[model samples]
Target chain A: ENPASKPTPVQDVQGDGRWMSLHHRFVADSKDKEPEVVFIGDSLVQLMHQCEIWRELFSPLHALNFGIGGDSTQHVLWRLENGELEHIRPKIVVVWVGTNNHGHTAEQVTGGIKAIVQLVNERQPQARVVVLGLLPRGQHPNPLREKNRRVNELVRAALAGHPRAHFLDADPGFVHSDGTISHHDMYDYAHLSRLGYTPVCRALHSLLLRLL
Target chain B: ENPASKPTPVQDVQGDGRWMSLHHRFVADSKDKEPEVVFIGDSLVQLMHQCEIWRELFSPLHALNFGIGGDSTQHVLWRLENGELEHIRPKIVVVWVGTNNHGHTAEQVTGGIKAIVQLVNERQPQARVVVLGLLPRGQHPNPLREKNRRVNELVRAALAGHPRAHFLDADPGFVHSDGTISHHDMYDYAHLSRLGYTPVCRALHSLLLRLL
Candidate 1:
């Protein structure tokens, strides 16, 4: 999970130069307007700023959302090291990935998150870190949700007692009374709809204030 | 709105031992756990933690939710002066207490939030302050909703360029496609339903992370 410890050629979800261009944009954006906060993750974090929530809420805070669709923990790790956080000195760095890495074990997911947090801390020692638990995937009692639960447990344990690091689990609201998540929360199993993103964002609000 | 400049005995929504006991509990809680995050407001903020989201997301943050069932800005000012923040050194203080003062003008609502932010800043200089816009009231486009809009505008202008303070509007998603609000977001014309709070909280999540 550690950048230095991990091997080379981290897989980028968007092949060719798309992800690279976006990374460059973030680098340029950082220099143009010094960001107080940065949200880093996969698609869930990406379309967040593109939605009404970003305009209504995040834009005022001088936030730059650096989320790439289909990115795994390794890809984020690569981006972090490859100049995503190089130009900016943000007050808070929010890390929300690992769902894309469902193929990885719970231990692996936990390790990836740990590595990402460590990398963020190493890069921006002044910035506080908030790690969101993976959103529940699939409807009902599914294997993916079970895996997410295990990953959440491991991630929670690893992040416990972290002075500047905070862990948030806001997915319960997404679950229906029958213990199944509805499309109302997630139009699909993984990605968030406009409606879906609200609860997750709200759950993290109080915690984010503390971290900031 | 400055406490020192203003007259004394700001109205308390609940008189006698109810308010006094909560204040005492806060004093005791401050000593019991050194909170890094505090949410101070009316019933909206108070009842937040009593629900599932608070337990799911905020309880783990070592947060202090100092919300009274019926309170206004002046009530919160009284609590602050009465030693709610006497012992603790919080990193962030969240202010959400103006709807109860709806009888007051938009300017007055903005002033109340401004005063609260100033007070929190004065008390906890190291703490970052997040001021949430008033959640919209009423089931349709009505006087209350218009008043909230005006209040939001003034609050936004007043808070503009304050280094340690941030303002968030979590109202947009609550509006229906036809430019009206439904009970889906709010059970009554005033208070939020279990479903209503999610979008609001989620909207604040990104901004909160940035503030942190």
Candidate 2:
């Protein structure tokens, strides 16, 4: 409810200043006449706020980043229960969970993906849900690449033909021609670099223009 | 659902260890198989596990402690919602909340107490609630004693009814003739020492047997 005030940082959440730094922004969007197109995920979504590419592209759109670090599907469930989308009804909801879930097996990741989809569908029935395929992280020919691929493929398969749900694999964007993560385009081996974001931005732009 | 394997030491939680500990123990008490009396409260009830005299006295009476530290009415409600009265119901339920609720004013405490009572009666209709009047917790003598007395009196008045709810005061057991908490009988200025437990044990034993 106190959207005007920025949340106290995660570091200050002990001692005298213990508050759940819930990055629940959609609620604030409800007050406006204009609905939002929320970019909902984990650290990837959080990093989106760092760059204004989404802002520059959709400046007219109210893009709320409802993401936090180290957030798993359960954490997201807790946020939703704690009223993350209580008042706000977005036009589109982009979901990119299963990154943390990827640490588990393909089955676990699939379960998490299904749960996330179900939760979003249950909460915001009218909104379109875009389930993002897991992006490959790490150096060329990393063992984690296979795990990530398995998880993403499982998610994509599970989410086939779901109403208002689409699977968006921006994986090719983060990868080099050698089918490994592009180091020249990444700040960290795991996350996106400015170069890596180019393809993701283009994918998102193109996806929005034509959903069929 | 996992009860502690042994009595949990307070030091273990904050002190040190790789294997961190957490527990959720809400004993369910029902009406027919219920004991004549049951102890209900926070750490005060939790500490009954540590109180040999009281423990011995209430051994046959199903004196289950549903206490968790820093718990307010909301927490208690959550515990209840998840099935607190599935098994060990008591004919006489010793109720002690509002000490934590004291951070709020009397009015708020009154509302919380009412909500709690309503929930309890609706959930377990047969358990006659014995309201334990608020215990004084401070360094000073007169004002602390007065505050405790005032709140307890308010609670007692509020619960004046159908021969089911009785207000039990621990003040007379701990407070000296001069009206200060006798230091020799207090662990802190607030919590009862071993010396203070003797009178409380005697009072509770009498109450439990009378209820039977």
Candidate 3:
């Protein structure tokens, strides 16, 4: 079986249940919180809530953040199956996972993302799914960056003109003209800084307005 | 401050993180699940998921259960603030709590329910708030049951003819002609059994269909 496709929980090395607790928090939120927009994926997506763009733009739109740090596509799939997709209906379901799938190939990562989108549709029939392309990571070109680019290409191609589900490839200008990623954009060449989320946030805001 | 109106998390006596974990699960769920109806209250509402009535009626309607065992009205309020009322908009929100607020008076319980209704309105603008009266508990008429009756009466009186928030006092034929409740309806004289949820389920289904 492909490791990326298998639905599994995050490894709780501390045994304190932070990941499961976070998952449960989302479950509880689905019970009553009324979020118009939903953002789900890995740490890159999870950290968005703490930034200025989320507070200024997405919070006003009633966006619920389901981003967990170090979440692979399979971990997200597990969360959706375990109650993340129940008892709540969001108008737009934003997916930005797969960057943390270091163990999987680009094809397997794309398949996992596809699986998550399918589950989102199955659970939330009324929602318009938005799958975001993997961002260019690392300060310089490496195997990981190359793999991410392949996944992004596959995702964009796979969802070329889908109606209910959309693919967003909003490049936030992270890569400069010198073929280098600026530290200002990505604080660690992976997790986006506040400045990095600007273009993507604006793009999502514009798309969400149209979708809403 | 009145204890009933104050929002608080359920006491974690075992320190096993069950209640907080449950709360976080809902938080995680709000990130994706699109529930049409969300029921938040005590064990009475939580146990609804395990019953045949839910599978037959509410499950099809995409209902989410936010009921925590031993949760008082104050606890429910805390959940709404923490993340229960965050992402995902439901057309109908059901409130059935206050029975567990034994330390507080009927008036206090009624105030807490009102606070909850206001919070729901503020969070979920499109939802038609459905506040269910505290059920008649115990085998015979006692102070606890009497207190519940008072709460029901006060809630009805307070929310008399509200346009947005609604009060539902659907007395599921639990009490017979005499003052006794049958085991078939409430096996333990408190927690609702499978047979007990029938009338309420039907009532909610009818109301929800009209609202939907």
lDDT of 1: 0.71
Per-residue lDDT over B14-131 for candidate 1, one digit per residue giving the tens place of the 0 to 100 score: 1222355566667887877798788888767875664327765666556888887557777787787678888899888888877666357767767777777878888889998888
**Ordered list by lDDT, greatest first:** 3, 1, 2
Complex DockQ per candidate: 0.01, 0.01, 0.01
- lDDT (Cα, tens digit) per residue for candidate 2, span B96-166: 66665534555555555555666668777888776667777543454435545666777777788646666
**What lDDT would each prediction earn against the true structure?**
0.71, 0.57, 0.80
| Candidate 3 lDDT score at position B190 | 66
In candidate 3, stretches whose alpha carbon ends up further than 4 angstroms from where it belongs are B1-212
Q: Best candidate per lDDT, number?
A: 3
Model 2 Cα lDDT, one tens digit per residue, A155-180: 77877878688888875556668764
**Prediction 1 TM-score vs. true:** 0.48
- Give chain B TM-scores in order: 0.88, 0.76, 0.95
Query: What CAPRI grade goes to candidate 1?
Result: incorrect
Using TM-score as the yardstick, the better of models 1 and 3 is 3
Residue lDDT tens for model 3, B33-123 = 9998898988778767643357778888888888776788899999999998788899889998998886688899999998999888888
